[PDB]
Each structure stands twice: as C-alpha cells, then as structure tokens.
Write a protein that binds this ligand. Structure first.
Ligand code: ZN
Length: 46
C-alpha cells in the first residue's frame, strides 16, 4: 500500500516554520533567526 523513510536519525529539534529537522539545539538557534520577517500570513502563537 504505502511506504517511506522512517528516520534512522533523531531530530529532537524541528522547525515548523519551514519543516526541517535539526540534531543540534545550537544549529536550530541560528536558523530560528531566519523566519523573523513578518510574513503576510497570520501568526499562531505570540
Ligand atoms: Zn526553519
């Protein structure tokens, strides 16, 4: 029926903003400073 990749690695940090995983609490930080711009779309939590 259906099948795909399970995810051997572990992504304890995800970026819902875009949808990418990060295996580093530090790396994600620098990345978090990317979706700052106030997109034309309404937020979700502030
Ligand atoms: Zn992101």
């Amino acid at each position: 029926g259906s099948s795909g990749s399970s995810g051997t690695g572990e992504k304890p940090y995800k970026c819902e903003k875009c949808g990418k995983g990060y295996n580093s609490k530090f790396n994600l930080d620098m990345h978090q400073k990317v979706h700052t711009g106030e997109r034309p779309s309404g937020p979700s939590s502030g």
